[PDB]
Every structure is written in C-alpha cells, then in structure tokens.
C-alpha cells in the first residue's frame, strides 16, 4: 500500500538480536570493559 | 428529507418509568396499528441450584397450561379469540413472555399477560403430561449436532461453576422434579425489580402507564473461573465432524466490546450455498471456498453478565479438519500484529448495516428495549452507536485483539469423527506466531 | 528513426517469421508461445475445434523433431496466413487481473 | 398445510445461506 | 410520510416510491418469468439464472462486483417463485446509487461466458440437496406435477437428467424473450421519486416482444404415490379452487383460518381449529393436520397437508375429510366467522409491517394489478364475505375431482378412490 506496521519495530529488534550476537558470538575489541573483561 | 447521519436523529426515543415496588415500564411509539407487549425476567439458569436444575425450562412449559383465574384452555381461546399470536422462550440468563397482538385490544392484553406471570394453576395432572415432554425432548435433541455441541463448550470452559451448566438440567432431575421446588424458586426470583415490562407500537407511553394498570410485581453473581481444557466424543459413525474453539471475553458493558464486534465481521463467514464463490472478500470465505476445506462457518459472540466468549464454529470432513485449524489461527494472528486501515472500512459498514436492519419491525425493536434494561439500564444509544463505532482505529483494533487472543489457553469442544484433530499442545503452540 | 528500415523490417519480419523453424515443422505463431499461469488459464477456455487441432500439431511436430526431419516445402505454413487464435482470449486473462492486482493496492 | 404466511414456498440465494419457506 | 406514488410509463413499466425517515433505503425489480415460463427443453434454466447473478456482466468484471458490494457494506438478494422472480437490493442511506447502478447491469447487461457456465453446474446438486431436506416440500412440487398437465407442474429445480444440459444460448435466449419493459416492475423505499425515476426510463426500456401467455395450466385429475424408508408417512389432498382477485379468492382465505392451525400459542395444541381437534378425538398419538391453500393469476389450489404414522394414516385421513363434508353440509358458527375474520385482519396486518415483508406485497399488487391497494380497502373487502358463500365455496372442494401425493412408506395409504 504500503502500510509498514509493526514489523518494522519488529525487524528493527530483529536486527539489533544478531548485530550484539555477533559481538557476543566474536570477540575483537573485545569492547570497553564495561563490567568485567579480562586483561 | 434523509441523510445518514440525519436519518438518526428523528426516532421516537426511551420513555421510562417506575412503580413503587420496583417494577419498570418503558416504550416506544411507532405510529402503528399493531403492538408487541412483553416481559422479561433475569432470573436465569446461573442462579438455580444442582437439585433446581432444570425447573427454569420446566415452568417455561406450564405458564400456558391454564392458571389461577382461567383454568386449563380457557385461556387460550381468549388469545385466539383476538387472534393474536403467543410466545415465549427461554435463555440461560432471561425468560421471556410477550404478545404481539392489535393496539385495540391491549387492555385485556396486560390484565392476561399479567395474571401468568406470577398466578399459575399448578396441578399435577399437567406435570406427568408435562414430565413426558421434556423426557421426550431430551434424547430427541441429540439429533441436532448443533445445540449439543455447545452444550460441550460451556461445561469444559467454565466448569464448577451455575453457569457450567445445562439449561434443561439432566435427566434425572426432570423425573424427580416435584412442584414444591418450583413454588419455591417461583416465589424466589419473580419479583421486582427483576421484572421489566416493555411494549412498542401504537402505544403512547401514559396510556400504558395508567393500565401499567393496577397489578402487582414482588417485594446474585459471583464471579466465574475460566479453564482451558479440551473435550472430544469421538463417535466415527456419523459424517461430518463439528468443531467450536473459543476463548473467554469481557461482559455486557464494557468499552471493548464494540472493538470485538468488529473484528468478527472482518474475518466474515462462508457457507455451502452462498453465491459468493471465489471472488469474495472474507480471507476465509476466500480460501474455504475454494477447496471447499470446510462446509460451512460462522463466527458466534456472546457476552454474559461478567463474561463472554469469543471463537468459531465450523464443519468440515474429516480428512480436512487440520488445514482449517491452521488458516483459522492465520486470520487472528494476522489481526494482532499485521491489520490495516483500508480492510478496517468494510468490517465498520457491515456493522452499521446490521445494527441498523436489526431494528426492522415491531418485535425485534421491543425485543432489544427488554435485555437492554436489564443490561446496560435504561441505554437505547441508537445514534452514540454510531458515535462509538468511529471510535474504531487501526491501534483501536490491534491494542484491543492483542489482549485476548495471542498468547492464551483456547477451549476446545468437538465431536466426533473428530480423530485429526490435533492433540491440544498443538493449537496452544499455534496462537502465538514466532513471527513465523 | 525508422522510415525505410521499417519498409526494410517487413522485409526482415514479415520476412524474419521466414528464417525461425517453427515455420518449417508446420507449427504456428502461437502454439510456440513459452507456458505461463495465464496461458495455463488462457487454454482452458478454448473451445474444441480449436483445442485438438492446437494438440495434433504439436503431436505431430515433436515425432518429426526425433525423426530429424522437415515436412516437405509446400505444405509449410505460409506467412500471409497467419492464425492469431490466442489472442482474443489471452488480452482477457491479463487484463483481469491487472484489476485485482490494482484493486488490491488500496 | 403450510403456504401459512404467505402463498407457496419460495427459494432464495444471494450470501447468507438460503431459505425455503411455506 | 407521503403515501405510495406509483407512475406507470409510456413503456407500461410500473415505477412506484415513498420517502423514509430511516437510514434504511432498499430497492426491489419484479419482472413476471418465473417457473411456469420454462418450456420442455427449457427446464432448469431458471433455476440456473437465479444462480448466475454473480458473473460478468457486459460492461464490469464478475470481481470488480463482488469486492465492490461488500466494501459498500450492501446486500444482494435474489428470490423465486413459480410466478415472479424478484432481484432485491438494500442498502445504506447514501450509497444506493453506486448500487443502485449495479442493478441495471445484472439484468440489463448480462454476458453469459460458457467458461464460467461450466463451473457453476456442480453447484445445483448443493442447492437442490438442502432444499428438500423438509419434505414438506417435497411432498409439494409432486402435488402441482398431479395436478396439472401444461405449465404450472413445472419445478422450482432443476431435474437431474438435465444437468448438464445448460447451454449458454438456452439462457441468453430466455433472457430476452421474457425479460421486457411491459413486464418489469421497479420498487423503491427509502428514496425520492425522481432520481428513481430519472434512471429507470434510460436502461430498462427495451421492446415490446411481451409475454408469451400460452399457459391456462389447464387443471386436469391425477395422483402420485412414492414409497421410501422413512417412518412417517407424509400425505396432501386437494381440489381446484378459483383464481387470485376473487371474493372466493376471498373467502377461501376465510374458510382455511377456521380449520387452518398456524400455532398461535407456542406448544399449544389449537383448540380453536376445529379441524385438528375433531381428528384428535377419535385417534390416537402424534399426528399433525393442516389446511393448505395458495392462490396464482389464472388459477390457485385448496386442501389440507397431512402428517402421522403409517397405521394412524388411513384414519387420519378419512376423519378429517369427512369433517369437511359437516361443513358443506351447512353445519357453521356465525361466531367462527366473526372470528376467523378477526384473524385474518390480523394474519394480514402483522405479515405487512415489516419493510421487506410490506415491500414484497406492494408489486405483488403491481405485475398483477398495476395499482395500490390500500389495506383499509383490503378490510373493507374482508368483511364483505357472505356466510352462505363460504358454505357454498366449500361445497365446491368436496364436490369436485381430487387429487394426492404422499412419500413414506405407505403400506396403509387410502387411494383416491376410497375417498
């Protein structure tokens, strides 16, 4: 129509899961420490 | 001249008024030659007792039977003698006695109407002709697929409750039934304020009031458990296999329940025999129609007291009965999340027609002024309707269905050749999307 | 910009129908057409007389493919006769449902 | 002895079902 | 508000208004081909055409239609009879003319594509399936085939041999023929009379052609037996009555509301209705008795439909009809009379009120008459019965030759000739 209801908050979510998946399923910067984070 | 919103507003409205004992009156002139004259009771089913199971639909019976005046089929022949026809029916919550009949002949009308109500010849020669027909008409009404199936669905959702029940009672009760209970639960609920009379017609409302005529009148919920179950008679002779699914809605008043009316109109209804074919509208009507997945369908709502209840009722064969299950859970769950404006327009005009073409004639407009006393009180709000439906939006509808319909415990009732049915822990998996 | 190419494209289309084979097998136009939902639905309504003389031509044009042979030349379709049959129907398919998929959009 | 509204029967089709009648 | 209008037009179709207060506004279209039309290789057409108001018209797709309707919220509704077929359209207050030209198209417009003839024909069987669950109906259309030779034997369905007889030129051929602008009557309600009348001489003047009268239905003796399995036999008897706009046609009417039981008290046994309280007392459990009648333009039929079980069958029978025979013999109750009119004051009134109910009985008038009736006049005309006349009329039904039908099992059933 197009009416984009509420899968785009949807989606949005969605799309902020993996992008910290990755992060949390990697490493690197490993990412200020914030709470601990070894040497 | 006419314009819709126009057309509203010149109606006669509500007259009201009261006695001193507590009985109502109220009316509606139509300019008219013909009158329905009624009354209606709340004293239901929910209320009887496990041993006065049943006495409600058992004096339904007798009223007309002859009375305290006029003994057995003296009475009669004076309804026939104006021609007029009788009537009277039974619901769990409401009984109702009323009379269409000319305007001329109303003063007798209420004088007879009156007298039943509360004098009635009770002799037990009527009871043994009496106790028959209900004993005939208890395993004659297996025949009707239909009003048993129902009689499933309350017992498994709300069972351990006056509501869980039958409204004819079992069996057993009917045999055992002596009129000392009747007398009693007679003298119980008849009285005011739990009566209301109601008329519309010709009738202006003082010259009833004065013949509202010198008679006289008289001198509880608790709320009830929702249980998500299951039931299934499984019976592999017959043919086809019925199903009704539902789950437990808001009472009479209440804000959602106009959002609610709207939805079941958009989901629609098929049936065999409708010239709708495959180009309708109805995703269901759409789709079913096709295969012809199932016969026929319809979306019920009924709202108690504190409670109603929400779902469909569908026929299918057998071998088809999955496949509805799953386009059903599609329609509801793409309400709650996926709905649109435009789609929302035909659901509101339907609703609007059928509000309105329910109002055609004298009984069903006096019908309705009846329940809605006892319900919303005096409220006939034919124009706010209208008001209220504009109410309806597209967050209206999703913030609304979101509540009652994802993430819930349905109650299922079916019977048989129900086999394909799926187990229960299946559907519960199937109200919720994953987003797939 | 085409003038008297166009006189030159008759020579070429009118002419090129002469250089694709389907002329040759005692095939048609139409008959060629790739399968799609609509002609899928544009079949069904033809009437027979059409219908068995669309299926002989084919089954007599795939027999000839394995044989790898050609009809002989003067039975081969002639361009000035040329059977449109499908049209009249397929324009219907098509148009009907440009307005559901219109409809649909709001 | 059904006419009993009206003169004989009837058949109806349109949406919502059908209807037959006396 | 103001009072019915009704205009004939040079065309000589009948156009007719009111104006309402009610957001309510319906139209209706009666045009005069009904069942006794179809011819013998003509039969099952209506009972297809009454089907076929879903397709393609000429100028609108078969979709565009039905999408259109619902959006609106409207309502289509088509009906039949063994005389008047009637497209019946309703709708909100404002939107009538978007509906009010798709009407036209239906009947005006039609295209009959033989691709989507074909996929309607499973259809019938569906249709034919849950009409004749009641009996009671069945019972009927054999009633009319003994009655009759010519036309008014015909069905209101299509036979099974004929199935897949259906060409697409049997229809459109038959749409021309008795659709006309002599024959066509447009109704409606809620709506002012010009813009009903602006619209109406446009379209739907078409010919001249008219009306093919060639069925007297000639009444003619017979009878039909069926045995089946079931437990309860069913059984009509009938003689000629005399045509509609009649003061027998009339009094007929009187004399089935002192015998003819409606219930007018919801499980009571009529009391009143001598007929089903002669029989019940010299017989025995379950039965049912009624009067039955029905009136058409050259002809209308009178007796009483029967219903018990295969031994109470023979008596039930031969106890009610003799009870007739008391009443042609001049046994009568001025008091019943009185009575009976009463009811039937009240049978009318009450069947009028309701819109669509008051609106079928206008044209009623209109294809038959061409003018309105007050129901005052109707009144007026009730009481003018004689009692003497209704005697006589009753002498008339047993006097004269007789026909039957039953389906069930029928191992005790009377013929005709023990009668």
Redo the contacts between chains.
């Keep these: 129509?197009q009416?984009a209801?509420?899968?785009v908050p949807?989606a949005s979510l969605?799309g902020a899961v993996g992008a910290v998946g990755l992060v949390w399923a990697t490493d690197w910067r490993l990412i200020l420490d914030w709470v601990p984070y070894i040497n | 001249t006419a314009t819709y919103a126009q057309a509203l507003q010149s109606v006669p409205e509500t007259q009201v008024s009261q006695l001193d004992n507590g009985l109502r009156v109220a009316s509606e002139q139509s300019s008219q030659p013909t009158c329905t004259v009624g009354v209606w009771i709340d004293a239901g089913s929910r209320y009887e007792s496990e041993k006065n199971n049943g006495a409600g639909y058992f004096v339904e019976h007798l009223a007309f039977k002859g009375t305290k005046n006029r003994p057995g089929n003296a009475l009669e022949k004076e309804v026939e003698s104006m021609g007029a026809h009788l009537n009277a029916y039974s619901t769990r919550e409401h009984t109702a006695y009323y009379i269409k009949a000319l305007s001329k002949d109303l003063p007798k009308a209420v004088e007879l109407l009156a007298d039943i109500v509360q004098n009635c010849s009770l002799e037990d020669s009527q009871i043994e002709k009496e106790r028959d027909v209900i004993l005939q008409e208890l395993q004659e009404n297996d025949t009707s697929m239909r009003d048993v199936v129902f009689n499933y669905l309350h017992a498994t959702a709300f069972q351990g409750t006056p509501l869980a029940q039958s409204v004819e009672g079992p069996s057993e009760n009917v045999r055992k039934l002596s009129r000392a209970d009747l007398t009693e639960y007679l003298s119980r609920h008849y009285k005011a304020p739990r009566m209301v009379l109601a008329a519309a017609g010709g009738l202006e409302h003082r010259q009833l009031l004065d013949l509202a005529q010198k008679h006289f009148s008289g001198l509880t919920l608790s709320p009830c458990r929702f249980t998500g179950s299951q039931i299934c008679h499984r019976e592999d002779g017959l043919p086809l296999a019925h199903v009704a699914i539902a789950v437990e809605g808001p009472g009479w008043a209440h804000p959602d329940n106009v959002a609610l009316q709207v939805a079941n109109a958009i989901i629609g209804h098929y049936d065999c025999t409708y010239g709708g074919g495959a180009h309708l509208s109805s995703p269901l009507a759409s789709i079913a129609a096709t295969n012809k997945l199932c016969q026929s369908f319809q979306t019920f709502n009924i709202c108690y007291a504190d409670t109603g209840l929400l779902g469909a009722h569908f026929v299918c064969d057998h071998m088809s009965i999955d496949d509805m299950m799953f386009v059903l859970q599609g329609q509801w769950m793409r309400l709650c999340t996926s709905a649109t404006e435009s789609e929302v327009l035909r659901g509101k005009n339907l609703l609007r027609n059928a509000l309105v073409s329910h109002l055609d004639g004298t009984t069903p407009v006096c019908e309705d002024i009846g329940r809605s006393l006892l319900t919303y009180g005096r409220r006939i709000p034919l124009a706010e309707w209208e008001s209220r439906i504009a109410e309806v939006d597209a967050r209206v509808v999703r913030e609304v269905c979101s509540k009652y319909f994802y993430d819930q415990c349905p109650a299922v009732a079916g019977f048989g050749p129900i086999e394909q049915l799926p187990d229960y822990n299946r559907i519960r998996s199937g109200m919720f999307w994953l987003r797939f | 910009a085409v003038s008297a190419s166009s006189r030159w494209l008759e020579g070429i289309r009118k002419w090129y129908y002469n250089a694709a084979g389907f002329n040759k097998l005692g095939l048609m136009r139409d008959d060629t057409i790739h399968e799609n939902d609509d002609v899928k639905e544009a079949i069904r309504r033809l009437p027979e007389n059409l219908y068995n003389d669309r299926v002989f031509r084919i089954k007599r044009a795939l027999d000839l493919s394995m044989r790898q042979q050609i009809l002989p030349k003067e039975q081969w379709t002639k361009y000035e006769e040329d059977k449109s049959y499908l049209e009249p129907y397929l324009k219907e398919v098509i148009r009907e449902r440009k307005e559901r998929e219109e409809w649909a959009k709001k | 002895g059904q006419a009993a509204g009206r003169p004989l029967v009837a058949s109806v089709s349109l949406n919502v079902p059908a209807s037959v009648r006396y | 508000p103001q009072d019915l209008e009704f205009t004939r037009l040079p065309n000589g179709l009948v156009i007719a208004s009111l104006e309402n207060y009610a957001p309510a506004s319906r139209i209706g279209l009666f045009i005069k081909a009904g069942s006794r039309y179809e011819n013998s290789n003509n039969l099952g057409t209506s009972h297809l055409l009454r089907l076929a108001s879903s397709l393609t018209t000429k100028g609108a797709s078969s979709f565009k239609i039905t999408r259109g309707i619902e959006a609106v919220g409207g309502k289509l509704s088509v009906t039949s009879t063994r005389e008047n077929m009637a497209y019946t359209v309703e709708c909100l207050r404002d939107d009538v003319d978007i509906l009010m030209e798709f009407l036209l198209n239906v009947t005006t417009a039609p295209e009959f594509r033989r691709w989507e003839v074909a996929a309607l024909q499973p259809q019938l069987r569906i249709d034919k399936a849950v009409a004749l669950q009641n009996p009671q109906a069945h019972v009927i259309e054999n009633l009319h085939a003994a009655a009759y030779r010519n036309a008014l034997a015909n069905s209101l369905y299509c036979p099974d041999y004929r199935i897949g007889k259906v060409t697409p030129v049997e229809l459109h051929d038959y749409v021309q023929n008795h659709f006309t602008s002599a024959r066509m009557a447009l109704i409606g309600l809620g709506v002012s009379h010009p813009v009903l009348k602006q619209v109406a001489e446009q379209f739907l003047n078409i010919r001249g052609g008219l009306g093919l009268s060639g069925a007297k239905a000639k009444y003619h003796g017979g009878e039909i037996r069926e045995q089946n399995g079931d437990s309860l036999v069913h059984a009509a008897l009938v003689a000629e009555s005399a045509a509609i706009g009649s003061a027998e046609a009339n009094a007929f009417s009187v004399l089935q509301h002192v015998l003819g039981a409606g219930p007018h008290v919801k499980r009571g046994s009529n009391a009143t209705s001598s007929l089903y309280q002669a029989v019940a007392k010299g017989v025995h459990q379950p039965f049912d008795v009624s009067a039955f009648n029905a009136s058409y333009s050259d002809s209308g039929l009178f007796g009483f439909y029967t219903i018990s079980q295969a031994a109470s069958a023979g008596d039930v029978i031969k106890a009610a009809y003799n009870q007739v025979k008391t009443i042609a013999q001049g046994n009568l109750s001025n008091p019943d009379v009185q009575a009976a009119k009463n009811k039937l004051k009240a049978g009318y009134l009450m069947s009028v009120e309701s819109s669509e109910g008051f609106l079928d009985e206008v044209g009623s008038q209109a294809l038959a008459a061409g003018s309105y009736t007050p129901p005052s006049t109707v009144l007026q005309q009730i009481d003018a019965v004689a009692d003497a006349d209704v005697i006589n009329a009753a002498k008339k039904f047993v006097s004269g030759r007789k026909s039957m039908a039953a389906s069930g099992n029928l191992g005790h059933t009377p013929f005709i000739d023990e009668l």
Excluded: Q, Y
């Design positions: 129509r009416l209801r509420n899968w949807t969605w």
